[PDB]
Amino acid sequence: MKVHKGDTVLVISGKDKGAKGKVLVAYPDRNKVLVEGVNRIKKHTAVSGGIVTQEAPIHVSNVMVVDSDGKPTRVGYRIDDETGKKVRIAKTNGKDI
Template identity: 75%
Template sequence: MKVKKGDTVVVIAGKDKGARGKVIMAYPAENRVLVEGVNRIKKHTRITQTQRGAQSGGIVTQEAPIHVSNVMVVDSDGKPTRVGYRTNDEGKRVRISRRNGKDI
C-alpha cells in the first residue's frame, strides 16, 4: 500500500470529495486508511459506569476508514499525485511523486 501513516491526502471520490486530511492509521490488510476529519460517522455506545462513578456513552462522532483507492497523496507542492518508487544511492526504496519526480 502506497499511502502511509502521517501522509497528507485528498479525497478524490465519495461524499467527502475534495477534503484534505492527515492519515491517522493505515490498515494494509483491508486496503483502508483512517483520515482525520473525513468520513465522520455517529456511533451509538452503551452508557457504562466508569470506576470513578462517571457515566460514559451516548452518541459519539468519529472517523471511519475509507478505501485507499478513494484518496491521493499530496506532494510537496500541495497537489495530489500518484506515488512511485525509486532506489536511492544507499540502495533504499524511497517514495517519489509521479507528478514532478520529487521525494515525498
C-alpha cells in the same frame, strides 16, 4: 501501500470528495485508511450514554497523497544505488514525498 501513516492525503471519491486530511492509521490487510476529518459516523455509545462522532476507515483507492507543492499525485519510486533504498517519488514534480 504507497500511502503511509502520517501522510497528508486528498479524498478522491465519496461524500467527502475534495477534502484534505492527515492519515491516522492504516490497515494494509484490508486496504483501508482512517483519515482525519473525513467519513464521520454517528455512533450510539452506551456505557451513561453518548452519541459520538468518529471517522470510519476509507478504502485507500479513494485517496490520493498530496504533493509537497500541494497537488494530488500518484507515487513513483527511485532506486538509490548507494544504500539500496527505494524512495517514494511524486509523479507530477519528481520530488521526494
